Structures are given as structure tokens and as C-alpha cells.
Amino acid sequence: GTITAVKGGVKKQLKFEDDQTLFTVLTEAGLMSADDTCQGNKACGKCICKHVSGKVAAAEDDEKEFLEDQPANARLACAITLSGENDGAVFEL
Ligand code: FES
């Protein structure tokens, strides 16, 4: 499917393959850097993005630990495993 990434007011549609994480999709497109990050291991909390539209499974306890001091709609890109149900979801970087 595909999701919409929004960086600097500019919308960019990206295609994703089932079971790919938003982190993988985002970083492999140059929209998000994987430098100094745990490389999508949900341990550094640097892959922050904002879920603004679409269906995305609620965050688990471990991820929530990293979003306590973040905006209400913040999520860890690597904590989100993309599947058909996420087709059309929009995220703001
Ligand atoms: S890449 Fe480290 S928490 Fe997502």
C-alpha cells in the first residue's frame, strides 16, 4: 500500500510493502535519518513522527514509554509495522 509523509509542509506519497516498518520506509526514502538511532529497535526513541490520519494500531507499553514527553500524536516510526490496514495513513515529520 502507500502512506503520506509530510515534511516541511510538503506532502510526499510513499509506497510500502507488507510488514515493513514506517522507519524503514521513511529512512530508506531520505525523509528520516537512521544515524545515531538504534536502527528501528525501539530503544533509542529518535524515530519520532506524528500520526495525523488513517488507521494505525495503538502504541504498546514499551513505545508509550518514549512518548510520555512527546506530543499527543507522537509515535515511534519503527514501532509501526505497515500492512494493508495502514494504506492511506498520513504521518508528519
Ligand atoms: S530507531 Fe530507535 S526507537 Fe526507533
Q: Please check whether residue 71 is in contact with residue 28, taking contact to mean a CB–CB distance below 8 angstroms.
A: no
**Cross-strand pairs, 53:** 90
Q: Is the CB of 43 under 6 A from ligand 1?
A: yes
Q: How far is CA 54 from CA 26, 35, 50, 88, 89, in A?
A: 17, 28, 12, 6, 4
Catalogue the long-range contacts made by 24-31 (C-beta closer than 8 Å, 24 or more residues apart).
Answer: 24/78, 25/82, 26/77, 26/91, 26/93, 27/77, 29/5, 31/5, 31/7, 31/93
Sign of CA dihedral 37, 35, 26, 75: positive
62 CB near ligand 1 (under 6 Å): no
For residue 12, list its beta bridge partners: 5
Ligand 1 neighbour 5 (Cβ under 6 A): no
| CATH number where 73 lies | 3.10.20.30
Q: In terms of residue numbers, what domain contains 85?
A: 1-93
User: What is the spatial distance between Cα 18 and Cα 67, in angstroms, rounded to a whole number?
Assistant: 25
The total domain count for the chain is: 1
Task: Note the resolution in Å, 1 decimal.
Answer: 2.2
